């Protein structure tokens, strides 16, 4: 009986780890996408703040 | 005997899930920090492109 319980929970803990590992890779990837989509708008920015201080 | 094996492995799977869950929460939090640090620079931007088109 201790067994059915230990095994059933091992299976649930493994299903939850694969679920959370799958959600960590999607957030970490959505990420370098966000972190990069920015260097571009922050750099378009030092530029688009410098020309109106000049005009 | 099947038991010592199912339990020991369950413990290792649980240790790995808590490790990966801890790394998903740090990336997802480093995240709303990045995603938000931007709404601010992209909005500071529609603004800092609108006043020089006006000046």
């Amino acid at each position: 009986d201790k067994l059915k319980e230990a095994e059933t929970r091992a299976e649930f803990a493994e299903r939850s780890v694969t679920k959370l590992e799958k959600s960590i890779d999607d957030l970490e990837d959505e990420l370098y996408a966000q972190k990069l989509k920015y260097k571009a708008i922050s750099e378009e920015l030092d530029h688009a703040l410098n020309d109106m201080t000049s005009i | 005997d099947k038991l010592k094996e199912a339990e020991t492995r369950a413990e290792f799977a649980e240790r790995s899930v808590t490790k990966l869950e801890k790394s998903i929460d740090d990336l997802e939090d480093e995240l709303y920090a990045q995603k938000l640090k931007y709404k601010a620079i992209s909005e500071e931007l529609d603004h800092a492109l609108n006043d020089m088109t006006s000046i």
Partner: protein, 372 residues
Amino acid sequence: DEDETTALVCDNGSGLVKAGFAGDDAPRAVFPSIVGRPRHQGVMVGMGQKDSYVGDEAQSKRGILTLKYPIEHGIITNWDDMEKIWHHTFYNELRVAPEEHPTLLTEAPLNPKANREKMTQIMFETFNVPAMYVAIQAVLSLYASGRTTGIVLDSGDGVTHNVPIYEGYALPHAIMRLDLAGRDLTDYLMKILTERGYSFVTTAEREIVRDIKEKLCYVALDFENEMATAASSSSLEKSYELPDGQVITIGNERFRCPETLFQPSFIGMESAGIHETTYNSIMKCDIDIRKDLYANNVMSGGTTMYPGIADRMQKEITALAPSTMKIKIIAPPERKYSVWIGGSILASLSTFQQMWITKQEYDEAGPSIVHR
């Protein structure tokens, strides 16, 4: 393959539908057994006017609809709204056309003869399925645990049952029904948790008390000196983080909720509890079959999943049963789908083909044919 692939298994519950293909190991589709009807005229962006909503879209949009439950206590109470849940199951959830798939359905323990004939009338005459079959739920649960004689304590969302089965025939006069289940149990936790000094105020607070019940609730053995333990205050406590930060703590109540299943008195119920009822079913059966039932207490249903349910039941009936007896409480891990899995097995089986009620049988014998 014609129908090896093709058999569908639909288990209709009071809270959830479980559905999928005979052959699979678990239900392809699981969703609430609701049918929402919009309280006001209007639309979602990009959609048309919808007359009705079913399953999760009814739950998600519950604030603008009047929600209705077709199955009260395991029995189909509204046939207009049930044909709606079936329609949704075939066409949207499993995305199959029903007119080329044999369909194994389930019914409840003492399901009125007339209902088994009515869902047959609707299966064959409005969905035009090739063939169908209605199995009794406890009977599929037992069978999914390999055996043919045993007694199933079956407990889901609106009903609890005890169905003693002998060489496959569920024993009508020994079946017991207790109308207190997981639904009742979430609402009691609710109060002992607001009573712990809390507030489940918005609907995002309400719904998650149920996810607290599922994740953190326990059935302690020696529930007596577990309250006593609570008081010395060990590291028995357990804090859950809400949709936001609001870390709620649940130490003790954690097990006061499933102690409701042994003590219905916790909720103003005067009925007997799960273990006594297991037993009473058993001293209502033939004498010669009582050693069999005792060594084969199979558990199935979402509400029998509370850890330590089996140990408490083990000791609950040992101590009521004559000592000459062998007690044995089987509680498998997949038990929230036992019923369904028993249907998947049975309907994919090599020998079941000759029990399918075909449109030939029906068009020729009337609903009586499948009724048995």
